[PDB]
Amino acid sequence: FRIGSTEPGAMLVDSFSLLEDHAPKAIEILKNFVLEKGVLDCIAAAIDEFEPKLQKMLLNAASYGKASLQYKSFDASIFVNACNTIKLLNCFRSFGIFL
Amino acid sequence: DDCNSAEKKSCWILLITFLITLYGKYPSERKDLCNKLLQEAFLGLVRSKSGGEFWEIMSSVLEHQDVILMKVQDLKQLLLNVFNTYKLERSLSELIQKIIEDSSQDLV
Question: Where in the cell is it found (chain A)?
């Protein structure tokens, strides 16, 4: 989210935001940054968010970070663990207790 | 193509002057051919680089136009026809690009 970035991340989100319009540009973006750190940060970025709107965007951006990756090079357990650990905090922030 | 193959600015200016003289001498049938030749010459000059000083050479050709000193109405009509032809040619490019972009988006 820092204004002005170059490392993996903050441009995978740019790729997802650019998607649905000028698709060739979005496809061509995924050829300069390694799709390892960006997807990891995207997955472990919505874990500590508050509003239930940025979490959705981060999760779908991270989901659009695995198809272009190698067939069997990245474990898929981290994504499931993050998506499951969001649920408990979201349910907790309903009865009054916040953590 | 032969003119582009060739100090080609002087040859192009001479050819333009000869074409203008032929168009003026020939009474109006060949007016459409003269307009097409002028448009082709303009396109070739644009693709040469106008060419900056070459366009100034065309401006120098305008000095030869002062030698011709033809009627203002004919020159205005020719300029308007050239501008209209350029606009019409540019119009279809947008549609072609839109079709290509739609096809590319569908493929993506």
Answer: Cytoplasm; Vacuole
Burial letters A28-42, b for 16+ CB under 10 A, else e: ebbeebebeebbbbb
Let me know: does A34 contact A11? Beta carbons within 8 Å.
Answer: no
Pick the residue from chain B with its C-alpha nearest to A26.
Answer: B108
Resolution in A: 4.6
Map tokens 């350029």 to a residue.
B86
CB-CB neighbors (< 8 A) of A23 in chain B: 104-105, 108
- Residue B10 host element (H or E): helix B8-25
> Which 8-state DSSP code applies to residue A20?
T
Q: What is the CA radius of gyration of chain B?
A: 17
Distance of alpha carbon A66 from the chain centroid: 10
This entry's atomic model was obtained through: cryo-EM
Torsion of CA A82, A87, A92, A98, to 10 degrees: 40
Q: Which residue has the tokens 């991340």?
A: A9
A22: closest chain B residue by CA: B105
